[PDB]
């Protein structure tokens, strides 16, 4: 196989904007004997986020466009995309749970993929249908809810992986769980201590969550 | 770095 | 089949950024009994330009990245893309020559697809290999060189389809044919009268070509 | 409208 030739490829692909080839090469490198160097880790993080992101965006728009006869095609078009969505998330939610989380014996990485898991189940949670919805909205809670606690006993708020979490896990409430009180709370909180107390990354995350309470 | 929205 | 359901789809797709579905739906609508309403005409124009454009960009970068052992993969990666390129252009260069040009009995449309034909053969001209190169660099000249003359005896310079042409056909010389004297000339020219003598479109095109002599 | 680069 040659592990670092696939890394060598995922670099090139990204530097070529065609992001599927990119997630493929990484999907590969992780379905190897994991413990993805942060580099690879992000590459993977970036690539997969681009595809599933690409789908979300398209899904959103098309839902509103749908949600008439034009509508059934809107529907048909939606499902087509939802699928593509689901298969991407089903795909990354694998590597995470089956290679990543268990092949990252370090706190940093621990809290990370636990966001990712949550991030993805969350996407799967928007796009849902019946009780499967509840099944996946819950699977996301626990996953987000497991590193918040992990970040919490292993490293600081002024660190972007935790701050970030707070943001996203905070948002897990508005868009998803319907607990604005908890979202806002979590955001005021994780923002709060952030201030208490390298440079940029934190700062950035730090604003966005505020920017967010400005909404809620 | 991490993920953001 | 239902002609206006495919239009109805190509709209939606574009409004969903997934541009292949978009070119497909139009590739369809034209491989129908053509005479594409300008609307459809542009939709087609836009969609196909997005895909083949997407490829060009990727090709450029990857060529320089290639052009070492890393290189063979660079090569392999290039060819992979070139292909995708060529099949897209082979595909649109069809509809044009076989449905479009002949199912557009009007001067406006006439000069248009004749740019498109030229545009595409031109892309096929970058990516070329041996004498096929010369075969395609020539096929582009004649096509561009046939509407310049058509725009010339049917409508004004202050019109974006002709101005635009001048730009592109001018560029057919730098990047392609290697006649900076003719490129510049054509650009000073088609720019020249533009001034002589609705609003915007022309203006815009008008700058870019100048912007271009600023380079040559 | 038309194409441009």
From Swiss-Prot, chains A, C:
Gene name of the record: YWHAZ
PTM-bearing positions, type N-acetylmethionine: 1
Post-translational modification: The delta, brain-specific form differs from the zeta form in being phosphorylated. Phosphorylation on Ser-179 by MAPK8; promotes dissociation of BAX and translocation of BAX to mitochondria. Phosphorylated on Ser-58 by PKA and protein kinase C delta type catalytic subunit in a sphingosine-dependent fashion. Phosphorylation on Ser-58 by PKA; disrupts homodimerization and heterodimerization with YHAE and TP53.
InterPro entries for the chain: 14-3-3, 14-3-3_CS, 14-3-3_dom_sf, 14-3-3_domain
Protein's cellular compartments: Cytoplasm; Melanosome
GO cellular component: cytoplasm; cytosol; glutamatergic synapse; hippocampal mossy fiber to CA3 synapse; melanosome; nucleus
Keywords: Acetylation, Cytoplasm, Phosphoprotein
Pfam family, one: 14-3-3
The protein's name in its UniProt record: 14-3-3 protein zeta/delta
Domain of life where this protein originates: Eukaryota
